[PDB]
Write a protein that binds this ligand. Structure first.
Ligand code: SPL
Ligand code: SPL
Ligand code: SPL
Ligand code: BOG
Ligand code: BOG
Ligand code: BOG
Ligand code: BOG
Ligand code: BOG
Ligand code: BOG
Ligand code: BOG
Ligand code: BOG
Ligand code: BOG
Ligand code: BOG
Ligand code: BGC
Ligand code: BGC
Ligand code: BGC
Ligand code: BGC
Ligand code: BGC
Ligand code: BGC
Ligand code: BGC
Ligand code: BGC
Lengths: 346, 345, 346
């Protein structure tokens, strides 16, 4: 009732309340915005899921969210966007993945310094990218996160004396894939792990929690999150990816995100638009593969660049099919509410 | 007369006729669009040239063209662009080059699955790139092809168990070049081989057939294709490229395309604009070496990125000289008819 | 008196007199535009600093400037920009760094051929980039130079039989940094060396001279040049860079340029923009590291790519703070005159 979707009522209720609680609320919506959700309860559930995988990653994610939100305020960015959590989600990722990609492991306190630095960067990236992309009425997605992360990880690299990153190298031989060995149960677990990997978690229970957090806000978003993850697995098997990479959900997170995006969030949901989302989800998985190989040559991970590039690409697609409709950015909420706008005008 | 230029007489006639015949027309015009030509007789001639070199590559080219054109229809893309062949050329290249860059050799039938998949992305890449580039009134050129190709070849790579690509590695030592062995005859043959390479064909006869196919539509385009190829050869020599790379036309195809593009087609042909096409063709050959080196590090070929980036760069150049005029995209056809618009505007 | 700032009085006097002096004026203003200065006395002084470092680089710089200026005239480019020197500074850099990155050493006379050819591409690169960037009211900065150089050095490479470039390879082990060895004297020298490295000069005297040339035109530009160089040093230390790299001013030149740009030149100088300039300079230094690692994998230097991208990113940041004001391109002079324009309309 009051804890579904955008929580419009709880938003209007807080407006008159203390600054501290209002701040905590924006942070939690910042966390949920990683999956296009603006819901503080979803934020709590996600944070819980993060504490379940790795309490270290949760801390860095939270520090990241706090610093960026505070930086957006220092730099007088738009209040609507802040309250909606749009100034926190990129730095939520910056903090988690910097911890994930650190060769120094859990509770390396020194990590907090470059996390804050890089989190402060996110409002700057967001603003700049917005100046360009809003001219086509495109969102920034997690481009701020991916630029910050690629920048940070290549500046340090595996051989930095203070902050070595994990070593990543290109493929240099044909992997042996034993097809009889392929487990049905393991593919099924890959689905929630693909979703877990959105926040860089490889735990199946965590991904289930994220699925639930999403479901609280929008069942349609939850559905596409799942399907996107599945399609990533399918693409993985089609190029003969090592099973262990599929099981770890590394083929599923970009696809999961792209599918949510196209499947009713940034395009109004119709059957044609649902087919479009599957296509985009597949395409993203294959671009994930491409970017992973190419970037490994420079010791970088692909991050969510593949999601950003493919999704932006599909949103710049135009058609003379009236059933394929791009939402105005200023009207973008969740699929259920988005669809009502489509039925009234198209 | 009827079989020259844009063939707009035959197109008007075909409009009333059966669906399947119209479709063959669009497919054939898609094939000729690789060299900016919208002519089904040129499409046929080019296809013959292809079937001559390697029927396997020819087949993949056609499957791409078909699948793309069908995807364009399925996704309600502009009709006129489809009928002009603008929705088939990128995938013609996707199919041919996916064959060239496969480590599996001829008639590896499975290759048809990814060729089809990648050919479906071509209308998507086209529309997305148009949404950006049309704001500066620029065409997308072969950017859809080059994106699709770089994506596919890097997602697979030389070490894919299913679809290995051919191994491509950077240069690791100074090539020994024996200058007395340089051959005028071989250099001269490198001219049509460079035009052949536009469709990934290293045969001088095939390249001759392509020049013939172009000439039928537009003598001026044919001339710039030849000139562009020549300038690429000059660029390779200027950089002491290994003779065999020059001989295989690898320095010629980007140059050739750039020279056609600037030399009458996207710029109105004047003596100034001709010099510009010469400059662009040189520049493009140089960028080709740059991109080939850099891309070899990640195991990719340069494709026709060089032509795409260089030509877009020269089209974005603004000048206060009235004799250097950029064609409005909606009024772009071939240099002979383009020049009439320029004189009458 | 008449030898500071634009020298708008002196240029108005030249508007009448012989073409060869007018041309020489443009070449000299072209040389100074490297550090955002349009002043021919500044140009002569910079030229002296180049001749002090290495006459061979100085020559190639000059061939660069002249050839590029001749080309912009041939291609009927805007004359206002030519007389201001905006058509010479990219090729000044092209000529100089082509000599620096040549593996053939001093007075390899054949080098003058591709220097001339790459200089001819500079106005082409400037115009096209202007076509795109002027839509957001942005300058091209040194993007023509950086495109020209990246293309040239990668088209040739270390293994080219005519024009081999110097060999650049990525980092492959953790360097050993002994902190007790850090030197105050060497660090102090790093500051002017950073400014010298804007023209690829590693001589502290040359960097001294360049500071003097800037000071002559705009003392506020001089201040930010020095601060930016210092912030790059601080960034280097913060990531435990090899001391010798910091001593060569390798961490200083990009951040120096960024600091001049934001700190009065393309943003009106206020307290707020001064701070923003310090942030942009730190940011630029870290991107320098990033771009250097990545571009070394393909055997290329970063050039001033980091400065170009960082500064453009900062010029695209919008805020609801009226103390942070972006200069209209048509209005940009030096910081002192810029601030006056701003205060009038504030
Ligand atoms: C349109 C007009 C406006 C222009 C505005 C300019 C915007 C400036 C953007 C500056 C962002 C640079 C930081 C991002 C990544 C870098 O760390 C490096 C660059 O090699 N990335 C890497 O090493 C790898 C990243 C590669 C990802 C592929 C990107 C498609
Ligand atoms: C302003 C709004 C527009 C936003 C639209 C976003 C468009 C994104 C395109 C996404 C598709 C990319 C596919 C092409 C190449 C990739 O596979 C990778 C990239 O790392 N290949 C490579 O590394 C090789 C590619 C190198 C070619 C040079 C690039 C100029
Ligand atoms: C908005 C629509 C208008 C589109 C207009 C197209 C503009 C065409 C510009 C293309 C010229 C670029 C050539 C420069 C350098 C290259 O040779 C090499 C290889 O890619 N650089 C490198 O390997 C290093 C490059 C690293 C720098 C990162 C670039 C962001
Ligand atoms: C504000 C400037 C921050 C830079 C200081 C970072 C200090 C790095 O910390 C160092 O890292 C070593 C290995 O990486 C560890 O063994 C030690 O904990 C520490 O000496
Ligand atoms: C979603 C589509 C996935 C297709 C995966 C094909 C699985 C069978 O793969 C087959 O396995 C054999 C040995 O087990 C190999 O010798 C064959 O090369 C291979 O095609
Ligand atoms: C859409 C999914 C396509 C899967 C097709 C996989 C094709 C596998 O191809 C296999 O390659 C082997 C080489 O290692 C050969 O020895 C086998 O004979 C061949 O069947
Ligand atoms: C296209 C302009 C470049 C001219 C370079 C030509 C150098 C080739 O050299 C020529 O090759 C001939 C082979 O046909 C030989 O007969 C000649 O002996 C030889 O001089
Ligand atoms: C535009 C006109 C195209 C010119 C085509 C010239 C083809 C010459 O081609 C040559 O043919 C010889 C046998 O005939 C072979 O021995 C050579 O290897 C081959 O290069
Ligand atoms: C369009 C410009 C073409 C370039 C022609 C270069 C001619 C190469 O000339 C060769 O250079 C070598 C030194 O590099 C010498 O050792 C050889 O004796 C000489 O013949
Ligand atoms: C535009 C074409 C320019 C051609 C430049 C030719 C450069 C000749 O390069 C020469 O090669 C010799 C043999 O390795 C070297 O010993 C010499 O140092 C070098 O000057
Ligand atoms: C821009 C036009 C200038 C072209 C001058 C090129 C002439 C080549 O100059 C040669 O360079 C060699 C390498 O340093 C020297 O060994 C020779 O002394 C010199 O003749
Ligand atoms: C801006 C960054 C702070 C600079 C750190 C200062 C470290 C200098 O260290 C000093 O170096 C001198 C050599 O010149 C030695 O004589 C001194 O003994 C030593 O303490
Ligand atoms: C301006 C920021 C200065 C950065 C902190 C410099 C102090 C370096 O601290 C050093 O950490 C090293 C771990 O790699 C140890 O080997 C050294 O013994 C220790 O002194
Ligand atoms: O807060 C959790 C604690 O976990 C331990 O493993 C770390 O060593 C402590 O530094 C940390 O405070
Ligand atoms: O984890 C790295 C280091 O972080 C520092 O902030 C703490 O003082 C140390 O206890 C710890 O070893
Ligand atoms: O009333 C809804 C109307 O909206 C328009 O924007 C559509 O193009 C019409 O075809 C439609 O009937
Ligand atoms: O056209 C398809 C067939 O071509 C023939 O020339 C070959 O013998 C076969 O291996 C191939 O499958
Ligand atoms: O070249 C591999 C091919 O082998 C044939 O026997 C199969 O029928 C094809 O589907 C397969 O792609
Ligand atoms: O200044 C011109 C002269 O300078 C000398 O130092 C070089 O060695 C010569 O190659 C050159 O002719
Ligand atoms: O590289 C570090 C070296 O610095 C010198 O100043 C010391 O005397 C050596 O003992 C030390 O090994
Ligand atoms: O007038 C400029 C001054 O403004 C104040 O707000 C700052 O605190 C000072 O540090 C600064 O020097």
């Amino acid at each position: 009732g009051y804890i579904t979707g955008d929580m419009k009522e709880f938003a209007n209720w807080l407006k008159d309340k203390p600054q501290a609680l209002q701040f905590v609320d924006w942070v939690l919506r910042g966390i949920s915005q990683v999956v296009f959700v603006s819901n503080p309860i979803s934020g709590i559930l996600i944070l819980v899921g993060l504490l379940v995988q790795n309490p270290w990653c949760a801390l860095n994610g939270c520090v990241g969210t706090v610093v960026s939100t505070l930086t957006a305020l220092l730099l007088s960015q738009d209040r609507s966007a802040i309250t909606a959590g749009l100034q926190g989600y990129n730095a939520t990722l910056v903090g988690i993945l910097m911890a994930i990609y650190s060769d120094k492991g859990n509770y390396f306190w020194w990590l907090l310094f470059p996390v804050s630095a890089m989190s402060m960067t996110c409002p700057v990236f967001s603003s700049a990218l917005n100046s360009v992309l809003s001219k086509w009425d495109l969102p920034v997605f997690t481009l701020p996160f991916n630029m910050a992360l690629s920048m940070y990880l290549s500046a340090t690299g595996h051989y930095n004396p203070f902050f070595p990153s994990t070593l990543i190298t290109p493929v240099t031989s044909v992997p042996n894939v034993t097809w009889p060995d392929l487990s049905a149960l393991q593919l099924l677990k890959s689905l929630p792990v693909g979703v877990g990997q959105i926040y860089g978690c490889d735990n199946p229970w965590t991904g289930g929690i994220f699925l639930g957090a999403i479901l609280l806000s929008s069942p349609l978003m939850c559905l596409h999150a799942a399907i996107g993850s599945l399609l990533g697995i399918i693409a993985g098997l089609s190029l003969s990816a090592p099973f262990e990479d599929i099981y770890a959900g590394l083929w599923g997170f970009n696809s999961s995100l792209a599918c949510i995006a196209i499947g009713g969030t940034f395009m109004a949901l119709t059957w044609q638009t649902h087919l479009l989302a599957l296509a985009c989800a597949l395409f993203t998985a294959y671009l994930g593969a491409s970017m992973s190989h190419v970037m490994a040559v420079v010791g970088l991970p692909s991050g969510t660049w593949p999601f950003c590039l493919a999704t932006l690409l599909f949103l710049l697609l135009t058609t003379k099919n009236p059933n394929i409709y791009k939402m105005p950015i200023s009207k973008v909420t969740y699929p259920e509410e988005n669809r009502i706008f489509y039925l009234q005008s198209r």
